[model samples]
Target: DIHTYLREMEVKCKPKVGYMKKQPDITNSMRAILVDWLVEVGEEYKLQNETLHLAVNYIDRFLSSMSVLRGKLQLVGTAAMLLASKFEEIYPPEVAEFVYITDDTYTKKQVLRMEHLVLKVLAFDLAAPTINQFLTQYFLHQQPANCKVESLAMFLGELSLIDADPYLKYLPSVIAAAAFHLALYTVTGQSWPESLVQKTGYTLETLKPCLLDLHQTYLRAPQHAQQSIREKYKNSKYHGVSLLNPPETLNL
Candidate 1:
């Protein structure tokens, strides 16, 4: 039966979070690792600033939503990176190139495996929305004399996307408003009211948690971070970080 099969798969796949105890910490760890690494590798590959990080977040967010098997976490991470490079770059790296990029921790075969799994997980919805799509439309409606916060909007909007709560899709307008809010914050250092978010159709109650997660990760990142997210799992050393090997039973 479908139910029985799903139950069996659930037991096996169990989501990668099974390996980690602190569920919320997963986002923080992913954020720290990816951000720092991007800062480091951005020079080597001449990667456009934040492009690789965006891809890493795509992987992190998707994994955060699903219970992929721990053994398969690297696969998801690599696959998301693959997709990101394709989306972000003019000359996309080959599968082997990505293996090289990882210094061989991930191989071409591993990336292929994860890519297939991710394809299955996303139900082939490979076409995700981009900041340009929503923002361009709104920008047109704005008064020409208004401040041009487009770059800041793109940065904050993409950060919000990494929040990966899935509920944000309900309020497209709110997403735009949040982009503007974050852009304004970047310039003014002033926090936008929760009501503005609510007026845009999403409550701060929903947005704050994700933003806070992004903030914590940004805070913890190294001076020159790159793209890498370790699977969160049990090793008994809590408070958001503890290294571990394979087959970990995560809390989330």
Candidate 2:
């Protein structure tokens, strides 16, 4: 019933695929940079994984309908993150802390007002779907013993948030399934598990495109200017999944 409710709200809350087309000044690359910074901010505040995920979702959906200038892009990200913190975190950071993170680039008033703008534009729909929310299903279903597989799947999942181009076109369900599939191959050397197949109603062919796209992102991850994801995952807590090697080519 939980998944039934989750699937119900997915397509409705997902951001439009070409929302950038409406923006005259901002671009996807700028959004990427903003998301990179948000990742760092989330870590700095020790935010919930769910909170960070919802923050990005708010940014995208807000962007989908509005035209924002490049100079104010960081403001949008900051406000969206603030909103996520309030909605998703128990001990959300104060407005002054957010203003400090921006180096006081935006006023406390500016941050507060923009949160209203994002809310008005996006509606009161913060209960959005996340790749992590879906990934939890695969992880709990089998409860794999090899911790690397679980961590690697999640690493790829966060990487998608960093580089949001074609990956944005795929639904959260697809990305979660594909990340799990790729992780299994990377750590255990196997095809899609039959248990997952019957549970998810997904086939290898359906997941092929997302799997390949994630592999390309993985190959490109080391070179990205935003090193926050790699930096955070390198420590022992995440099992250093970001440091795991990617296969040159996925066979299946």
Candidate 3:
């Protein structure tokens, strides 16, 4: 039944591409900052990863449908998180916590109003497949010897969240496969191999574009700029995979 639900979701949740055609005010950089901040906020609240992903999904879909002002972007993001936490978290936080996280910049009424708007626009749909789900599918087949590859893949996946390049154009499967490939290559120091195709149904050729974009995203940012995600994996619990730097060249 779970698989059936997820399958139906995948079929039903395809967002309209080029949805931002008319929204001249919202730039990718603005969305990037909001997403990055949301990542940190989610970490602060200790929300489930699924909650973060779902919130992002909601944000993207809503942005596609409506023209939002830059000033109200944070409200939209917080509302999405609130909706996602309710959908995915076992014990979602009270609305007060969300307001407090915003430094009381927004009141409960404002959050509830935005929540209503987002749900109305998105038509109360939340069953979309995200990057994590695809990564999970790949890992289920290609078990790693340790958590290094898994941890790094998760790191790469989260990295993709703050970035709009691949997230905007690529399917979740493609993004997950590219992240998996990058993680596999980083941990194993191996080039793209044929087995990955069999495991994920994505060839080196298909994944190379997204893969390059991810590498570039990391390269463009100074190490300190990536601290949010890097610090998250630095803990021994995650095997400190963030401390292990991958080579600059994608050929390797």
Candidate 4:
């Protein structure tokens, strides 16, 4: 029942794809950098991946409805992460720590003010479903989880989050489903597991579009200048899953 409920909310809360058209100065690449920076900051605090995903969602959601200047972009990123931490973290870092994380680039007052605006403009909708949530449920559906496969899928999902332009069109459920699908195929030459059909309620045909973009994102990630996600996943803690190669095609 909860799964069915969240699926409905995903579409309702989804950020508009190509929402940058609303902004006069900022662009998608700028948001991409902000997301990567949030990844690093989350690592510093050992925060949940949920926190990072929620933070990016907050940024995109807020950006979708607001016209923001290029200069204030980082402030939005900072404030969103703080909001995400509070909503998703057990012991979210204090306001002072988030201030320190920015190297004092944004004052405590500024972050709070941005947070206030984001909440108001977003209509206080913070319970947005994230790819992390769906991916976890999908991973658990595997009778005994495959650590490497889950890790690879997670990297792919986060990649989608960072490269938001191509991905924002897809809902969190579809993106999570695609990442899991691609991860299984890349890791083991397998397609979506039969059991997942019942769990995710997503078939291969429906998942094809999102899977293609995720594959391309994976293919292009190494060439991209922002290396935070690749570098972060390279460590042993994450199983060094980022070092693996992606397949030439889904060929679905």
Top candidate on lDDT is 4
Model 1's TM-score against the true structure: 0.52
For candidate 1, what is the lDDT?
Answer: 0.47
Task: Tell me the lDDT of candidate 4.
Answer: 0.88
Off by over 4 Å in 1: 1-28, 35-61, 64-74, 87-90, 145-148, 161-173, 182-252
Give one digit per residue, the lDDT tens place, for model 3 in 7-82: 4575467555566666777877787778888878878888877788888889988987899988888999999999
Off by over 4 Å in 4: none
Ranking by TM-score: 2, 4, 3, 1
lDDT (10s digit) by residue, model 4, range 141-205: 76667888898889988988877667888999999899998888888788887888877778999
User: Which stretches in model 3 have alpha-carbon errors above 4 Å?
Assistant: 1-17, 190-196, 223-227
| Residue 150 alpha-carbon offset, candidate 1, angstroms | 1.6
| Winner by TM-score between candidate 4 and candidate 3 | 4
Q: Candidate 2: deviation at residue 12, Å?
A: 1.3
**lDDT order of candidates, best first?**
4, 2, 3, 1
Instruction: Please estimate how well model 3 matches the true structure, expressed as its whole-model Cα lDDT.
Output: 0.78
* C-alpha positional error of residue 48 in candidate 3 after TM-score superposition, expressed in Å: 1.5
Candidate that beats the other on lDDT, 2 or 3, i.e. the better one: 2
- Over 127-237, each residue of candidate 1 has an lDDT whose tens digit, in order, gives 443444445554554434134355555444544433343423333344555555444454444444454433334454565644454344334422323323221111121
Name the lDDT value of residue 190 in candidate 4.
81
